[PDB]
Amino acid sequence: MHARSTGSYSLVTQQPLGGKAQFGGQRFGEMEVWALEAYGAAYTLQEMLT
DNA sequence: GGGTATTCGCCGCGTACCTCTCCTAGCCCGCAAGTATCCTATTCCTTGCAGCGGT
């Protein structure tokens, strides 16, 4: 069981770290982006990767 | 030249997460530490020159 709201940030590319050791967040993988595009949902996707 | 066959080389092969370990090799030069050696004294003996009483 794990959670993250606002923690650290990677260095080269500003994205949340990964893994439970560091306080990282989950990964909104490619297939999930496809899935969100399949709905009419556009605002949520745009915010979720911007 | 030309239509064809055969070979060569490049491109590709699922998502998300958890645990662990390990991450250049070799030379070189200053440098700390530890040591064997060399000069430093003391005691005995036998010389060589300058003062010195004595007449």
UniProtKB/TrEMBL annotation:
Transmembrane segments in this chain: where?
none
Q: Which domain of life is it from?
A: Bacteria
* Biological role stated in the UniProt entry: DNA-dependent RNA polymerase catalyzes the transcription of DNA into RNA using the four ribonucleoside triphosphates as substrates.
Fill in the subunit field for this protein: The RNAP catalytic core consists of 2 alpha, 1 beta, 1 beta' and 1 omega subunit. When a sigma factor is associated with the core the holoenzyme is formed, which can initiate transcription.
Q: Record's family? A: Belongs to the RNA polymerase beta chain family.
Q: What is this protein called?
A: DNA-directed RNA polymerase subunit beta
